[PDB]
Design a protein that fits this description.
CATH superfamily of chain B: PDZ domain
Structural class of chain A: mainly beta
Number of domains of chain B: 1
Radius of gyration of chain B: 12 Å
Number of helices of chain B: 2
Shape of chain B: globular
PDB class: peptide binding protein
Strand content of chain A: 25-35%
Largest sheet of chain B: 5 strands, antiparallel
Entry title: PDZ Domain of CAL (Cystic Fibrosis Transmembrane Regulator-Associated Ligand)
Distance between the termini of chain A: 12 Å
Number of strands of chain B: 5
Number of helices of chain A: 0
Shape of chain A: elongated
Largest interface: A-B, 6 and 22 residues
CATH architecture of chain B: Roll
Chain A: Cystic fibrosis transmembrane conductance regulator
Oligomer: heterodimer
Distance between the termini of chain B: 9 Å
CATH class of chain B: Mainly Beta
Keywords: STRUCTURAL PROTEIN-HYDROLASE complex, peptide binding protein
Helix content of chain B: 10-25%
Helix content of chain A: under 10%
Assembly: dimeric
CATH topology of chain B: Pdz3 Domain
Order of helices and strands of chain B: EEEHEHE
């Protein structure tokens, strides 16, 4: 979320 | 072990896939969450379990997963997925 990982 | 899956989402918006990885997690951007009938069944070629390293022209920047996010976010409505077997 804030770090860098993600959900598309 | 590269595999190109062309996913072009328009109007509707959003994708339907999830990723995590990079130098932060000491890993590659790997697909970990794939909603049914979502980009897995929409590009007829997406599916978790495969290792991700390239999108819209092999771009998985080396930092944190967001290096892909930045890549997929600003690219275009077409998500090209180049995946490798873990």
């Amino acid at each position: 979320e804030e770090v860098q990982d993600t959900r598309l | 072990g590269i595999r190109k899956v062309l996913l072009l989402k328009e109007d509707h918006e959003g994708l339907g896939i999830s990723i995590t990885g990079g130098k932060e997690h000491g890993v590659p951007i790997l697909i970990s969450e794939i909603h049914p009938g979502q980009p897995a069944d929409r590009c007829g070629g997406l599916h978790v379990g495969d290792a991700i390293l390239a999108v819209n022209g092999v771009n998985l920047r080396d930092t944190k997963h967001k290096e892909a996010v930045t890549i997929l976010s600003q690219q275009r409505g077409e998500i090209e997925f180049e995946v490798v077997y873990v």
